[PDB]
Enzyme design. Sequence first.
Site, mmCIF file in Angstrom:
data_model
loop_
_atom_site.group_PDB
_atom_site.id
_atom_site.type_symbol
_atom_site.label_atom_id
_atom_site.label_comp_id
_atom_site.label_asym_id
_atom_site.label_seq_id
_atom_site.Cartn_x
_atom_site.Cartn_y
_atom_site.Cartn_z
ATOM 1 N N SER B 133 0.492 -1.271 0.174
ATOM 2 C CA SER B 133 -0.086 -0.051 -0.054
ATOM 3 C C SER B 133 1.259 1.415 0.399
ATOM 4 O O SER B 133 1.847 1.122 0.691
ATOM 5 C CB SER B 133 -1.266 0.013 1.252
ATOM 6 N N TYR B 146 1.880 -0.718 9.856
ATOM 7 C CA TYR B 146 2.947 -1.529 8.657
ATOM 8 C C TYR B 146 3.512 -1.904 8.085
ATOM 9 O O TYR B 146 4.220 -2.691 7.314
ATOM 10 C CB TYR B 146 3.141 0.367 8.136
#
Lengths: 234, 236, 227, 236
Positions: B133, B146
Amino acid sequence: MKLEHKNIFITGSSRGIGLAIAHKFAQAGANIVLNSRGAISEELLAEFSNYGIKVVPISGDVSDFADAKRMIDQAIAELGSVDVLVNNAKMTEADFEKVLKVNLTGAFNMTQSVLKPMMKAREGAIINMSSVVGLMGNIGQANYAASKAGLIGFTKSVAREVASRNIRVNVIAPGMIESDMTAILSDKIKEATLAQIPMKEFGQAEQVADLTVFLAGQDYLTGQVIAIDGGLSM
Amino acid sequence: MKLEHKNIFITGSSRGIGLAIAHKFAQAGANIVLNSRGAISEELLAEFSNYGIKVVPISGDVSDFADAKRMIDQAIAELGSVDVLVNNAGIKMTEADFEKVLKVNLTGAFNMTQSVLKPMMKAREGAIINMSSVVGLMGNIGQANYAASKAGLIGFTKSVAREVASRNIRVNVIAPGMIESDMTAILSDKIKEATLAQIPMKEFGQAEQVADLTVFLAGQDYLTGQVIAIDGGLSM
Amino acid sequence: MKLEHKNIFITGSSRGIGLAIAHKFAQAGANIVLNSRGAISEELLAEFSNYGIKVVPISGDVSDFADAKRMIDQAIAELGSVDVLVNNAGEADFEKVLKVNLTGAFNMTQSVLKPMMKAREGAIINMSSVVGGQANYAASKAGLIGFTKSVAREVASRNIRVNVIAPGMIESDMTAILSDKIKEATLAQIPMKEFGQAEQVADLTVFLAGQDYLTGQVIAIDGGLSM
Amino acid sequence: MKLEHKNIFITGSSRGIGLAIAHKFAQAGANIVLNSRGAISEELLAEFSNYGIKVVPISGDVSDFADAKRMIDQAIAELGSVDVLVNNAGIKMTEADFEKVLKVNLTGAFNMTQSVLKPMMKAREGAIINMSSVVGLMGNIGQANYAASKAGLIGFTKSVAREVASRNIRVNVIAPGMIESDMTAILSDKIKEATLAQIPMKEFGQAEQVADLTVFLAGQDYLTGQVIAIDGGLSM
């Protein structure tokens, strides 16, 4: 379009993969330095007089610090700049170790030499390349892996230092490439060699050239290690 | 040339980088599947009319294993094959919406990969590109989540690549950095100069650069198991 | 003994690899949870009653998150805690089993983490399924490896170790009774020219469970099959 | 016990981690060769007299192939065989010869491995455990040389493992992280705290963890060609 009229210095580009890399850069409209530790023949110089690009032969010893600087200086004086530097690279283990060290030293010296002009122009790309993988014994594998790791760490270090000056620095790691000798080898030894490549085939020189020219023109990509080796180095 | 007439399934390709990826592949002469969790508008389809390729809309839930299988089959039916899968799934929000978007990227990458591997391994050919992402504004907790999700997508990709190399399938990861978006022009200069200061190359990426790398990898034979960040050195 | 009185929850431990792991843990003095989809037989419990440990049977469905949490809660209620989780993973039938096994590892891992994270310690050992083609086999093993690395990253700062074991071909009833020309061609594919044993997988599982400061690893015990 | 009466040749085992390994092997009932460049003190041999095992001092230069061969022959002639070879390494002063101890340790693994492979292949049994050096506080040039010699040791190990797998010989590498040592109290709170913060498990390792992993690999059958990091997640 992104590479037309750019000036590409390709070390070791009189034979083998370096020559494939140089043909591919020429097909993209870039100006070409052909470089060898030996001489550049008028034969080779003529293959490149159909692309309508400037081609310059520059011979020397990349592994000699002052002579590496001389070769970069000549390319700058004859082309105007070096926009892209491609650092393209026996039987006893001791001589095999010496060859690896020479090629590593050459990559170090040529990288050091172009940094100053590229940093002035706020512009450029350096592509370092580990050598094509051949048949090696246990100790040759160790020496090969050590020198490749050395090239990666150096290249990452340089990437960090020159990023703010808009210079992209990357490493390409080829694997085992077909050559005219491949046809000549025994089906026994090919099979035991292919066995160690996850994709169960040999690479082609043109794959390395395509990746090299792609990286040269690709902004915003720096500090990367890209192996193109059918999974060999996984 | 090398992608002309190939069939590309691009997940999450109704907007943003997914859509930029679809445009590059069309410009290479590949046929493309546009995909979204919701319907694909007629005006979005209209954007692809001058490319002289086939464009197929397939909407669904990539994170639903049954519907992931459904969408791949439907793409094979309407196009003939799936030669390239680009997993780009997921779209102010808080930390919980951030985890969910991360989990959708992984789950969708997992399910769509498992589905498309059935025909590709039988055909002994294919390329799969997993996109992590795009990196936005992140605090403490955000970066931790993340980093764990990226470790998952990379581990998954390298393992799959190992497993399927012998059947001539190439699997790689692209890791975009901070990419200029339609949003970016309205951000404030203080927040911009403060995030640029985190990027070694002192600039934002272009969606078109991510698209170029995606198309190059899809056509580049003998390159597999790689993780390629395109992020101006952010992840160095 | 690094493991005496540690509390080991071992999924799928009624037969095969999981049973062998349960025996090695019991031999190291650990308390164990025996688990399977169906009920734990009375025989099985009795085969563990002379180790001098607490043996807790807990049946249920790992691939259902609520039942996963019920099972962990039950284990924490009956033992001190859950110090080590071993996620053992024994046509369309093949696909459904892989899915239950991968979902099982995800559900049980999530359920066990909050207690371990608070305790500053724990160990999770994931098991990929033995070898011997499918898209689903490849993607599911990779799925487990990617999940393992994600979780190892997530929980390392709380001193929780997460690792995967990738076994190769293991001898079994199935191996023993097939063609002696197929075995020959099959063994030829393994660099060490022999099949593995469940007990080798079990020794590795116990070692990792007890070994400090080792996390995020993918350890193949497969005779070089995956080198 | 899987190691009782097996014959273990441990290089560099007169001090540090190598000595710790020797003691763990003796506690498993294994016969031991204590080895160092200089001669083994009679006081160090006395530490092992209590174990009921046989303990043999063998000194020489592992980085000399002729002396490497001779050391191995001596061990066979005094213990009967070498069942397990542990190529141990490890370390205040200069960068000049940080590289020197790396190269000496590295070539030591080369020669000792090459020397024991002949009798193990004939015996059809055996185990070899290579070990990268402990990660310490390093300048940039230190880290560069450290990363290169570690990569070399791993490539050597994988290549030999492939060579000898069919003769029932297991070959693996241990990759330690940062070992808490005497250089740990001296380091300032800025230094420990910043260093510890780079280790994902936020703690320093112990020599005993490396020694435990070494003993386990020596006894673990069917496990070969692996690189096992016991480093708090440093290289994950």
